[PDB]
């Protein structure tokens, strides 16, 4: 079983988006009004699941083939790859990255999305990948398109991919979103504006990576994720 041998750097809650961000409307009735209580780190917060033995299917990170109904998805073919490190710059090997996203027109494969852009019979939109020894992960997919949503009267979410990352503990787990370099919708989005600092928004922007693209085939973006920094305990209970 898991041992309590690490502490995690504290979160900077003025860097992350706060809970109450009124232009993102649903945040109004879903944000606490009392202050969070701070508690020290114990074995509960410092351990978490390890997925090295989950049995991944062979196409799990390849969204051009894992849904497959006899053919390929329509849309821009792209590899989305990067590394996961901690704040000390140390790779985070064998971690689980999960990601889900729309199709080329912005439609999500879900009961409630009645957007009028159609479904793509060959695309499902889900991937998972355990990072290697070196913190690397990779997916293959199509570039999702933007979608309108019911926030203000003409709001468009920019193109995006949702990421879920586990890290070494429930203290490091994070859910975030990846945007795409140059999308002119990035700065008008209320969800992206829920992040107050413009340099915190830049880290959510995936950058075109020509170096990792397959010539005559697909482009590549690079997206690197930094999790809370991990350190050994020291001078504790004297």
């Amino acid at each position: 079983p898991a041992q309590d041998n690490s502490r995690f750097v504290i979160r900077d809650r003025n860097w992350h988006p706060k809970a109450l961000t009124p232009d993102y409307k649903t945040s109004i009735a879903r944000s606490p009004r009392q202050a969070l209580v701070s508690i020290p780190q114990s074995i509960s917060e410092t351990t978490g699941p390890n997925f090295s033995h989950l049995g991944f299917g062979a196409h799990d990170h390849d969204l051009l083939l894992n849904f497959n109904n006899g053919g390929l998805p329509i849309g821009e073919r792209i590899i989305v790859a990067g590394r996961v490190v901690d704040q000390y710059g140390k790779p985070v090997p064998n971690t689980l990255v999960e990601m889900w996203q729309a199709n080329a027109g912005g439609r999500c494969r879900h009961k409630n999305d009645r957007y009028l852009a159609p479904l793509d019979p060959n695309f499902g939109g889900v991937g998972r990948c355990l990072t290697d020894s070196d913190g690397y992960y990779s997916f293959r997919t199509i570039k999702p398109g933007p979608y309108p949503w019911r926030n203000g009267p003409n709001d468009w979410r920019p193109a995006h991919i949702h990421f879920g990352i586990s890290g070494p503990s429930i203290a490091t787990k994070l859910i975030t979103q990846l945007y795409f370099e140059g999308d002119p919708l990035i700065p008008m989005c209320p969800i992206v504006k829920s992040i107050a600092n413009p340099e915190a928004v830049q880290q959510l922007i995936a950058k075109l990576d020509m170096n990792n693209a397959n010539p005559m085939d697909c482009l590549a973006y690079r997206f690197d994720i930094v999790l809370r920094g991990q350190r050994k305990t020291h001078f504790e209970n004297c």
């Binding site: 969070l36 390890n50 049995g55 889900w100 009961k111 949702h162 880290q203 930094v226 999790l227």
Partner: protein, 200 residues
């Protein structure tokens, strides 16, 4: 001051979080292996319990698109970190409240006692992280049991909460569902009866 690299900032999991992580509950086809709400298989050691609840927004309406992740010790108070679908007990699991299930549920065992960093026992508890559209960064809380009143009262984490009335919002109320021992635990996000949330 020394500055390290900054963490990647959080964004809301969104309304469609079920497609990437609650595959079944979105009624999309599953893969061979999914992480779900069955922490203990029927023959794992311990006292088998079913947990259930609802989540509320601050107007008192139901949150039907929330997604939860739980982490608890086994009945011996040990955290089981090697996640495997063959094990009898896994310390991690995921559940969700849907348009068709206003309620989440989890099947597990009552966790055993673990100590904090100073050596002091914590009352049995289950760590909960709550995600949903509208929540920009996830919410941390702990579910405790109403039948462990004495341990709950000497708990070094529950005792950091200043006001006694706030400590109650973390206490799941025992009940029974078809001969099986169940505990309810509602979460109020905002308002009157606001569940305590943590930062760690």
């Amino acid at each position: 001051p020394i500055e390290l690299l900054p963490e990647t900032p959080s964004q809301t999991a969104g309304p469609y979080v079920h497609i990437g992580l609650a595959l079944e509950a979105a009624g999309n086809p599953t893969r061979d292996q999914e992480i779900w709400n069955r922490l203990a298989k029927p023959d794992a050691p311990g006292e088998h319990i079913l947990l259930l609840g609802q989540v509320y927004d601050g107007n008192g309406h139901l949150v039907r698109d929330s997604f939860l992740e739980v982490w608890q010790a086994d009945a011996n108070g040990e955290y089981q970190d090697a996640y495997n679908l063959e094990n009898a007990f896994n310390s991690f699991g995921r559940t969700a409240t849907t348009f068709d299930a206003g309620e989440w549920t989890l099947h597990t065992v009552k966790p055993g006692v673990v100590n904090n960093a100073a050596g002091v026992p914590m009352a049995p508890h289950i760590n909960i992280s709550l995600f949903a559209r509208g929540i920009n960064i996830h919410l941390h809380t702990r579910l405790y049991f109403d039948d462990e009143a004495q341990a709950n009262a000497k708990c070094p984490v529950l005792n950091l909460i200043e006001q006694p009335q706030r400590r109650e919002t973390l206490i799941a109320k025992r009940c029974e569902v078809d001969g099986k021992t169940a505990y309810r635990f509602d979460i109020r996000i905002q308002g009157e009866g606001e569940t305590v949330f943590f930062d760690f």
